[PDB]
Write a protein that binds this DNA or RNA. Structure first.
Lengths: 186, 74, 184, 69, 52, 79, 198, 130, 83, 117
RNA sequence: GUUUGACCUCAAAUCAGGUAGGAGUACCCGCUGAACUUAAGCAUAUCAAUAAGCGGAGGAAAAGAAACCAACCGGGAUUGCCUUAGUAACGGCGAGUGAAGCGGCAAAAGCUCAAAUUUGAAAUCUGGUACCUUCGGUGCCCGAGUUGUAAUUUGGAGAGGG
């Protein structure tokens, strides 16, 4: 499989070849609009390991997001990846956002490729391995931080390090800050 | 008593040309040995700063080396 | 005057590529096989075009009809799948490797020529992935190779490999020289 | 601006030389596309230079003030 | 009801106006305007010590 | 555990401090100052032990011409 | 003659109290080299060569409250696994005194250190480890602080005192103060057979 | 509420549903033998104990075989295609018991089946045929 | 008593999977060196590992990775300077 | 600890009886749908960590692969018979392993399996 | 070939059909987000990771089968209740904030891809048409796909053969 070679090459991003590729691609995307569709993914291995399939129904999109944040010191911890996912979802509300992967960045803007699946297409609806995305509960996954980046931002992970938000910080706060009274007082 | 080991040469604690540190009213203080210091950037640094400001820089255009691909796999 | 935005972007891309300095790994393409040897290679490959959907369906229907009323040799065809080709290469199974110079993702095929050189399998670069696709009943393939040539064409394949060696591997053995794209 | 900050950093022994090295329509984008110090910013800026109830409440407050003052 | 009595808007008329300092509903031209609210003494107001 | 290893380590690590001026040594052993739960007598004992070496170093520096007291014109950083 | 450099690194689990000691040690040891947190140990041999550090002060921490200081020389120096209990540092306000940063110290050693081979062995390392080269790059001329060492109840007590001259002189306690105990001693730098066990 | 107040006042009526009684008396629907012996008057645990089937494997919280014979009684109460049969007939009539020779028969043994598989198929063919 | 029941995923730390090692070597040859690896090799050519280790430590988060990077650079140099 | 608006969220468990009744009804429904089989899977006998409680012996998630193999069946087939199987639990006590094997053997004897059809 | 055709990129159709806005909003998932009030007057702190505002879902939602918890004769998806506990810990140890393993119970379901060639046959699928035993099935045809759709597989291994 050639995917291993692609994955190994993509790790050496600082390499001269990948540096030139990024220099060309950032200008190519900077000439295009902020949000523009991509005919095919620029990193087939990364998309494939993220659930991408070369079948009708899957769509690859590219979106540009500004970098940077004591007036401007306000953090506004909304992540750039989450903002890009939300923007592409809103522009493609009929589509569903699965995940996104880093493809390039610039001193002033960042670039991410996002994979979308159309639940209306019969191919996805008739596929047992992908029909789950058509469930209404999966509507606008990015809008609720259900994606990989969204889950990472929420800090939902096993272990003591994520006790505050092991199952949502708001839920834990509500549960802990509630007086429990039984019929027979303890 | 004792064990297998190699007696490595001693280490000289000399200060190299670069060690992340420099070397040392009517006066500007006192120098080493305690005597008063009576009162009285290089162009290369400015050039380097200007070059860095524009990402200007040895040659990266050397031919590739087929150190691994030269040996045909058997 | 004004021109379409996409037309302007693609036109400027050519100028940028010509003027921009590329690393030795890049520009290994466009040092393609000469027209005559590439034409001969395509002629040889055309004799081994894989069975198309229509022909395969016709053969299967004929076999079914024959069975309904009541031992061919191993099929021979060119291998073109990039994953399949890469799996055949590094196993010392492929005899001739063709690589397209206009693959949209350049990084997808930068390692293939070097990998073939390391494995010692003969390889060549030809202009246009569309030409490779046309002979395999596909839009594009970006690669093409032969694994089991018929005995009648074994000598022809050996002679073609020998010629390609000198034509490409020896003429472009210095492709690793000073970075390309150094045009005013 | 960052040039002045780098020069100021090089002025003191925090860093030295060893640490430093440790188409028109396209060049326009290239030209337009690190930590800074307040002291360096100030230095460069300087260098750039060429009723019933109411009455009862009032009486109660006056009594309280007299008792405590 | 936890919201009983709270579904009303009223404000005290300062002090020294020859009227009780109980907050009175604002508005006007409705009859209820100017009537006391939020007090146990007020008609239809919140009961003292609600039975939680 | 034996004194042989201690001797072997000392012979290789010990330096000839006694063959150089006090400025190169900067160490004084408090003679007869062989030093608990009181928390008051212990502090005074440590104070006297340090003061003995302080006086020894003061005398050693007085033997030299280098000034001992701070000139009062020195304003370097202080810990 | 006195040319040496001390390497200091923080072990995994170093807390604020140990960080205070590590930071205030540098203020009196200008020749010392400070490096970020390190963990498993043997890399110290390479780190010393990187910065030409003749001595290493590795603060091992088996727990997030206990502190274990290691004193040795990189190439072939013996190592002593100290254990510190009374973790008092400059953060305490009881040390109202102040000392010139980088000033040359005055070292005082208890006579009891010469009564046993182990005490003599540790004294040799302590003499130069806590000192400072006179004419080093970061050294300073004047002497304004004193380091004191004492041993009682089989445990060594570490103390320091500022020296103040009155218009003959008096000394005021300054710097960190703590007690240390010797756990293990090895013949080599973080290796070799055990030498002595307390 | 707003909608509820209008709905009661409206003449559209209500979608009256009564199923509280049916939520308790649930008829067993996963076995005929148990159903013919199950007693809805008793509880699930009581019914299981009467039938003998163990309701819970772990120790229950708090303090607490004719049918089994019927369950036991429940324990006591594919030929090769035409082409495959013809192929086995050819193999038998051309080679016989010479499995080693049949294995190397390039003509008939296009599929390089093992000797064990060939003999296993031949035994089934003999059982089903002459 | 001890039972040594069965292995786990941690037992799958076996050999380097020489195919993967070949892939990594090919990528390293084709990819080249990063802008900091270029400085590392340039200083190794004249200064040796002395400056290269410090540069790697400054770039990397720990010396454990710096020593591995220095070893990899030395291995690459050895083959390149002769093969 | 009343510096917050706790009065807004005062959860009183008035429902205890109704919740218990609903749980009993759910158990009855499961029995109706799972009549032949037990409501709960056969759990193993395990020893507790946290030495303060190691003296106590308590149930576990499921038997290990080694225990299932020693019991004379397979993990994949064991699940269909209601035997809980744990693919991450390692065996470290011979006494507990023998007890688990004996329990599995007894369970295999007590179970009766109807024809697949 | 002063030509014709392959591709790659980009356009328009009242092209054939689908998808989105919005409403409701007690509960759910994210972003944003203060003050009154409480303290040793007060910047740390408390009010509060609340009020209000914005975006996205259903009968529940999130999370969910450890790069976990533990230091034992070790436990083995997540979630919920008593206890752990007003303890550890945090807070000018100042008012105050404040957990989690284990223990008892409810429920207990596991799994799916990437990365080894179907290579002796892209065996995969949307769409249009003619029929039928019309929540869909068959023949025919253009297409999506080789920059990877079918089968198997996730260390609990797994794969090629007897």
């Amino acid at each position: 499989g050639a995917y291993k070679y692609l994955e190994e090459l993509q790790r050496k991003k600082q390499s001269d070849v990948l540096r030139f590729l990024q220099r060309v691609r950032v200008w190519e995307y900077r000439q295009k609009n902020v949000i523009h569709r991509a005919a095919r993914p620029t990193r087939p291995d990364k998309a494939r390991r993220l659930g991408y399939k070369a079948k009708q129904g899957f769509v690859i999109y590219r979106v540009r997001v500004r970098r940077g944040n004591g007036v401007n010191e306000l953090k506004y911890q909304r992540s750039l990846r989450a903002t890009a996912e939300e923007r592409v979802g809103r522009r493609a509300a009929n589509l569903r956002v699965l995940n996104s992967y880093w493809v390039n960045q610039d001193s002033t803007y960042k670039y991410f490729e996002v994979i979308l699946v159309d639940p209306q297409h019969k191919a996805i609806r008739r596929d047992a391995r992908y029909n789950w995305i058509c469930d209404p509960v999966h509507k606008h996954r990015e809008a609720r931080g259900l994606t990989a980046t969204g889950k990472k931002s929420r800090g939902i992970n096993k272990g003591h390090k994520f006790n505050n938000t092991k199952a949502g910080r708001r839920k834990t706060w509500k549960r802990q800050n509630t007086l429990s009274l039984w019929r027979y007082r303890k | 008593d004792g064990s297998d080991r190699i007696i490595k040469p001693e280490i000289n604690p000399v200060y190299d040309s670069d060690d992340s540190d420099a070397e040392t009213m009517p006066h500007i203080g006192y120098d080493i040995n305690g005597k008063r210091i009576m009162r009285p950037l290089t162009k290369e640094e400015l050039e380097l700063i200007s070059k860095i400001q524009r990402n200007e820089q040895i040659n990266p255009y050397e031919p590739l080396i087929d150190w691994f691909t030269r040996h045909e796999e058997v | 005057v004004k021109w379409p935005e996409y037309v302007r972007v693609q036109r400027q891309k050519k100028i940028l590529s010509i003027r921009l300095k590329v690393p030795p790994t890049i520009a290994q393409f466009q040092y393609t096989l000469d027209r005559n040897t590439a034409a001969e290679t395509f002629k040889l490959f055309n004799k081994y075009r894989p069975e198309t959907a229509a022909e395969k369906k016709e053969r299967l229907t004929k076999e079914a009809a024959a069975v309904a009323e009541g031992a061919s040799p191993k099929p021979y065809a060119v291998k073109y799948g990039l994953n399949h080709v890469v799996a055949l290469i590094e196993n010392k199974k492929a005899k001739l490797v063709l690589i397209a110079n206009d693959v949209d993702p350049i990084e997808l095929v930068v390692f293939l020529p070097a990998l073939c050189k390391k494995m010692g399998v003969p390889y060549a670069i030809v202009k246009g992935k569309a030409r490779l696709g046309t002979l395999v009943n596909q839009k594009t393939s970006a690669v093409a190779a032969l694994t089991e040539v018929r005995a009648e064409d074994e000598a022809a394949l050996a002679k073609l490999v020998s010629t390609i060696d000198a034509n490409f591997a020896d003429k472009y053995d210095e492709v690793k020289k000073h970075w390309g794209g150094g045009i005013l | 601006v960052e040039a002045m900050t780098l020069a100021h950093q090089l002025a003191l022994g925090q860093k030295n030389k060893h640490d430093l090295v440790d188409p028109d329509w396209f060049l326009e984008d290239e030209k337009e596309h690190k930590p800074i110090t307040k002291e360096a910013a100030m230095a460069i800026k300087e260098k750039i230079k060429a009723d019933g109830v109411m009455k009862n409440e009032q009486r109660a407050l006056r009594r309280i003030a007299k008792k405590h003052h | 009801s936890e919201k009983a009595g709270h579904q009303t808007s009223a404000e005290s008329w300062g002090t020294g106006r020859a009227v009780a300092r109980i907050p009175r509903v604002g508005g006007g031209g409705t009859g209820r305007s100017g009537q006391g609210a939020f007090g146990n003494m007020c008609r239809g107001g919140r009961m003292f010590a609600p039975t939680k | 555990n034996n004194t042989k290893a201690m001797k072997h380590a000392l012979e290789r690590v010990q330096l000839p401090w006694k063959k150089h001026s006090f400025q190169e040594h900067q160490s004084v052993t408090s003679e007869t100052n062989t030093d608990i739960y009181d928390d008051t007598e212990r502090e005074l004992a440590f104070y006297k032990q340090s003061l003995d070496a302080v006086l020894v170093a003061r005398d050693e520096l007085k033997r030299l011409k280098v000034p001992f007291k701070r000139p009062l014109d020195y304003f370097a950083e202080m810990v | 003659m006195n040319k040496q450099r001390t390497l200091l690194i923080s072990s995994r689990g170093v807390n604020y109290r140990h960080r205070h000691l590590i930071q205030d040690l540098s203020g009196l040891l200008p020749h010392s080299r400070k490096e970020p947190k390190l963990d498993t140990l043997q890399q110290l041999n390479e780190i010393a060569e990187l910065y030409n550090c003749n001595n290493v002060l590795f603060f091992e921490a088996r727990k997030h409250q206990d502190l274990y200081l290691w004193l040795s020389k990189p190439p072939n120096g013996p190592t002593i696994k100290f254990y510190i209990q009374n973790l008092h540092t400059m953060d305490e306000l009881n040390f109202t005194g102040n000392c010139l940063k980088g000033s040359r110290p005055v070292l005082s050693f208890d006579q009891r250190f010469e009564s046993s081979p182990h005490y003599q062995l540790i004294k040799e390392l302590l003499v130069h480890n806590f000192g400072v080269p006179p004419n080093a790059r970061k050294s300073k001329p004047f002497i304004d602080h004193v380091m004191s060492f004492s041993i009682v109840d089989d445990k060594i007590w570490v103390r320091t005192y500022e020296i103040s001259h009155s218009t003959d002189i008096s000394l005021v306690e300054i710097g960190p103060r703590f007690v240390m105990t010797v756990i293990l001693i090895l013949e080599g730098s973080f290796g070799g057979p055990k030498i002595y066990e307390n | 509420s707003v909608r509820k107040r209008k709905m009661n006042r409206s003449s559209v009526g209500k979608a009256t549903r009564r199923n509280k009684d049916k939520q308790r008396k649930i008829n067993i629907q996963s076995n005929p033998i148990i159903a013919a012996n199950w007693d809805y008057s008793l509880t699930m645990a009581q019914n299981y104990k009467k039938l003998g089937l163990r309701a819970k494997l772990q120790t229950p919280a708090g303090g607490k075989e004719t049918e089994v014979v019927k369950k036991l009684e429940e324990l006591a109460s594919r030929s090769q295609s035409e082409r495959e049969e013809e192929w086995l007939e050819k193999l038998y009539k051309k080679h016989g018991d010479d499995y080693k020779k049949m294995f190397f028969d390039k003509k008939l043994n296009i599929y390089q089946q093992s000797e064990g598989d060939l003999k296993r198929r031949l035994l089934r063919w003999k059982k089903r045929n002459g | 008593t001890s039972m040594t029941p069965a292995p786990k995923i941690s037992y799958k730390k076996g050999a380097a999977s020489n195919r993967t090692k070949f892939v990594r070597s090919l990528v390293r040859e084709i990819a080249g060196l990063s802008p900091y690896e270029r400085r590392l090799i340039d200083l190794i050519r004249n200064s040796g590992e002395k400056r290269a280790r410090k540069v790697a430590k400054k770039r990397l988060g720990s010396f454990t990775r710096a020593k591995a990077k220095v070893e990899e650079m030395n291995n690459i140099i050895a083959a390149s300077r002769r093969h | 600890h009343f510096r917050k608006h706790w009065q807004e969220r005062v959860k009183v468990h008035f429902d205890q009886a109704g919740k218990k009744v609903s749980r009993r009804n759910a158990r009855a429904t499961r029995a109706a749908k799972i009549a032949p089989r037990p409501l709960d899977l056969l759990r193993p006998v395990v020893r507790a960590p946290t030495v303060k409680y190691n003296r106590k012996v308590r149930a576990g998630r499921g038997f290990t692969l080694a225990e299932v193999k020693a019991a004379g069946l397979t993990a994949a087939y064991a699940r269909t018979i209601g035997i809980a199987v744990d693919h991450r639990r390692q065996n470290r006590n011979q006494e507990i392993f023998d007890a688990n094997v004996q329990r599995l053997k007894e369970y295999q004897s007590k179970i009766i399996v109807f024809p697949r059809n």
